[PDB]
Design a protein around this ligand. Structure first.
Ligand SMILES: [Cl-]
Ligand SMILES: [Cl-]
Length: 162
């Protein structure tokens, strides 16, 4: 398993504009288009992102391209972030994937807000961090996905995804 297959399981793939769990306009493999209510604002962002008139629909290839950009940007963002970088550097390969997953879903800023959990992961207190991560809106809002990420941090294996 790798970051790509993990995220593909969590986000799914959709070739037409859709609303995410928060009601925002999205397309492909979890690529947020806009927090705006307007479907037109979404269609505009989409065409800007793809470089063609899409009319709310893209191809598999286009979806995978946005996905590659997004994963790269998530990684680069962690590496540039003063709060995230030290955590990432301290972790093993599997756990690294779990932090990238959180970042892709909630943004660098959002994850950087999990101060206590971050400190516990850095210290390698697996069980404690798992319990702390579950005390969040994130967990209450998307519990199945959260549980999968959480187990990954707890165990350092891919069992939740197998
Ligand atoms: Cl809570
Ligand atoms: Cl969920």
């Amino acid at each position: 398993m790798n970051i790509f297959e993990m995220l593909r399981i969590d986000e799914g793939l959709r070739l037409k504009i859709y609303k995410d769990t928060e009601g925002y306009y999205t397309i492909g493999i979890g690529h947020l288009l806009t927090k705006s209510p307007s479907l037109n604002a979404a269609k505009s962002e989409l065409d800007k992102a793809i470089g063609r008139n899409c009319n709310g629909v893209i191809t598999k290839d286009e979806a995978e391209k946005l996905f590659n950009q997004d994963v790269d940007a998530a990684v680069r963002g962690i590496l540039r972030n003063a709060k995230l970088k030290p955590v990432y550097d301290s972790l093993d390969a599997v756990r690294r994937c779990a932090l990238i997953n959180m970042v892709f879903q909630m943004g660098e800023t959002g994850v950087a807000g999990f101060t206590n959990s971050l400190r516990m992961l850095q210290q390698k207190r697996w069980d404690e961090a798992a319990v702390n991560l579950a005390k969040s809106r994130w967990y209450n809002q998307t519990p199945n996905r959260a549980k999968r990420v959480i187990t990954t941090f707890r165990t350092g294996t891919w069992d939740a995804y197998k």
